[PDB]
Amino acid sequence: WQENKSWNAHFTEHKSQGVVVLWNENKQQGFTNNLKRANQAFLPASTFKIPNSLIALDLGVVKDEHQVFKWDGQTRDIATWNRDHNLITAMKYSVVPVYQEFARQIGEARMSKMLHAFDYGNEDISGNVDSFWLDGGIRISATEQISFLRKLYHNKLHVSERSQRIVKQAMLTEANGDYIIRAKTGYSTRIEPKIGWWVGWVELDDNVWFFAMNMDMPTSDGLGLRQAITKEVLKQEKIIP
Amino acid sequence: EWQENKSWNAHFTEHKSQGVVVLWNENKQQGFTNNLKRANQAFLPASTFKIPNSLIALDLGVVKDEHQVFKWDGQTRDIATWNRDHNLITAMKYSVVPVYQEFARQIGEARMSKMLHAFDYGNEDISGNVDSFWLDGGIRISATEQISFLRKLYHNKLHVSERSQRIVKQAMLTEANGDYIIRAKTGYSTRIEPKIGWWVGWVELDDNVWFFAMNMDMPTSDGLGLRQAITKEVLKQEKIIP
Ligand SMILES: *C(=O)N1C[C@H](NOS(=O)(=O)O)CC[C@H]1C(N)=O
Ligand SMILES: *C(=O)N1C[C@H](NOS(=O)(=O)O)CC[C@H]1C(N)=O
């Protein structure tokens, strides 16, 4: 591990506070601007769709990435939620109601088991079975996110290979002739401190770079900064052109 | 049901080129092309053959997974990116012929033939060298047949394991953003006339999938970038991508 305080400038520049954590898989070395915050545990929020998807698939609650989840007919704040979805589009548009339903069908007991098996964060499910990742007892740090993601990448989680491959497909965010990004965004709004998350990895020809960032987010105005700042660090470290 | 629409020829004309683009709307089950006749003309698949080759290699265990390393044989070749170690992902990306030759040798004539017949792939003919028949042998496929093949792949309906099909689709990943995902493979038939360039694959949207297959005359390697550029001009035109 290495602290690299120079990255703070990217935060400073956007009048922001937070942490970016980076792991070099070939060299097994981590890098971060803030070793203390990198180990600070927060609510996972919508980053919880990763393990939730995994569990739903492995238990057959979700058959596959094509299965349609019908809108319940209730209009909500985010327009893209008000329509039918599959796993691919539910992940992309971060469709809460679909993931709530997954969680209800999974159930308290099986959800607890799976998180303990995943070694995920503090493994605590206290709260509502369908919102505990948003305002219940579960907490995870950036470094623990990486550790989780590394298992997922290598297909080493205690779920089927197939489930893991489907989720990684659903995490696809960006790809071109230089890199592939698989990742998931999040915004913890109910409990202070309000924070934005971006976690995932960058795939290169020769290596893989895992990432996990969070940043203070008092309003939804700054959301774009999750990606923008992470990329500024990736460019700096010459991981992406 | 197919529709000809000759307006797309302009995109070829504008780059002082000849060829065909074929499009298939999966939701509507309708095809579109600028040239119905060329769309059904069969050509050597060349490097587009890496799709079914990858599939077969995986399904038989010749390739364990997308991470398995294929060591460079130490012979320096024309294309610099081939002169290094590769996995399935990078071998597909940089279209590394020697790796795919080795796969083919290990697969063998008999198993390769059975699999292609089972895939209903092109004319199903393997005549020629077991490791180059897709480049100078007897195998031939049309753009429409490419689509029909790709459609089976997309729906996991080929006669190989689900896992193999998923891995290959992953390896076909070319481009992705917030508007579309493109999974595809390029090709350049150089040994036998007519020299042609290929691009085949599909465009994934939130709500639909658009399959594509194009080929175009390619007397020199100068025009290679036009495979993608022209295809995208049609896709823009039809408002499939922005
Ligand atoms: C997830 O954290 N949420 C669902 C949705 N996600 O958008 S995000 O992934 O860009 O963060 C809106 C924010 C959040 C929520 N309030 O439930
Ligand atoms: C494949 O058709 N080939 C291998 C490599 N691929 O290039 S391409 O995919 O961009 O078309 C070079 C061309 C061709 C060959 N010479 O064998």
From Swiss-Prot, chain A:
Post-translational modification: Carboxylated on the epsilon-amino group of a lysine, with the resulting carbamate functional group serving as a general base. Probably N-carboxylated at Lys-49 at neutral pH in vivo and undergoes complete N-decarboxylation, at pH 4.1, in vitro.
Keyword hit for Thylakoid: no
One Pfam entry name: Transpeptidase
Gene3D superfamilies assigned: DD-peptidase/beta-lactamase superfamily
SUPFAM superfamilies found in the cross-reference section: beta-lactamase/transpeptidase-like
Result of changing R182A: No significant effect on catalytic efficiency with respect to ampicillin, nitrocefin or imipenem. Very little reduction in dimerization at neutral pH. Predominantly monomer at neutral pH. Slightly decreases thermal stability
Active site: S46
Outcome following mutation: S46G: Increases thermal stability. Abolishes hydrolysis of cephalothin and decreases catalytic efficiency about 60-fold with respect to ampicillin
InterPro entries: Bact_Transpept/Beta-Lactamase, Beta-lactam/transpept-like, Beta-lactam_class-D_AS, PCN-bd_Tpept
Record-level Gene Ontology MF annotations: beta-lactamase activity; penicillin binding
EC number from the UniProt entry: 3.5.2.6
Induction behaviour: Expressed from an upstream promoter, P(out), in an insertion sequence IS1999.
GO BP annotations, alphabetical order: antibiotic catabolic process; cell wall organization; response to antibiotic
UniProt keyword terms in alphabetical order: Antibiotic resistance, Hydrolase, Plasmid, Signal
Binding of a beta-lactam, residues: S46, K49, S94, R226
Activity regulation field: Inhibited by avibactam, related diazabicyclooctane (DBO) derivatives and by bicyclic boronic acids, via a covalent binding to Ser-46. Inhibited by chloride, bromide and iodide ions. Not inhibited by the beta-lactamase-blocking agents, clavulanic acid or tazobactam.
Other observations noted: When OXA-48 is present in clinical isolates of K.pneumoniae, increasing chloride concentration during antibiotic treatment reduces bacterial growth.
Family according to the record: Belongs to the class-D beta-lactamase family.
Function (record text): Class D beta-lactamase which confers resistance to the beta-lactam antibiotics, including amoxicillin, and moderate resistance to cephalosporins and carbapenems such as cephalothin and imipenem; in the DH10B strain of E.coli. Acts via hydrolysis of the beta-lactam ring. Has oxacillin-, cephalothin- and imipenem-hydrolyzing activities.
Entry protein name: Beta-lactamase OXA-48
Organism: Klebsiella pneumoniae
